[PDB]
Amino acid sequence: KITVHFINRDGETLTTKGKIGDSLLDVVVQNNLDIDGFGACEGTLACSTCHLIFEQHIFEKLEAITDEENDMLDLAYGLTDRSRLGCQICLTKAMDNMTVRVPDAV
Amino acid sequence: DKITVHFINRDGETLTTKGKIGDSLLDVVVQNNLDIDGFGACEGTLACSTCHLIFEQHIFEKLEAITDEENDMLDLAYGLTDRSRLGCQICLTKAMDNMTVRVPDAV
């Protein structure tokens, strides 16, 4: 179990624990996080509601992104250079105590 | 005299600096020459949105009354939130010490 911090759109910081090997969507869903409309296609790589923004140093070590995730992510809202589809990212001991931000929205 | 202001740059990196009381957040970026691209285009004349800034609720909540002037300009800013304001209209006060503002996301 590792700690993960989610900075919601409201500006609030949600600190939770997730099991190694789990997807960030599994963490949100299973821990019943506040984030709205997160993980709609349930990891089918059909949407981008699981869009998460990472810290440069964590972003750099993530599994190489596939064109499948990339093509969908490129059309997502509030994109950044450190953006990834949460459902495709699984927790690693290295991600312990990291902070992921949820894309902005009025 | 001065106060501390934490600026979260677009690249996610956090840059802190100090500005004089009465100075606009725009003045802070300019004078201290912060590395925030295309920020302050119209130079505080409310003729752009490039000074858009995201604030912490506890602060945003206690800012100067939003003027229709700013509203009609802030609505054209990309990546808006419920804690956005035009940095050039926000002048530093003591209650803002050690605050953290974030530049809207942009690829």
Ligand code: FES
């Ligand atoms: S939940 Fe749809 S791509 Fe991740």
Ligand code: FES
């Ligand atoms: S610098 Fe243009 S509106 Fe503030």
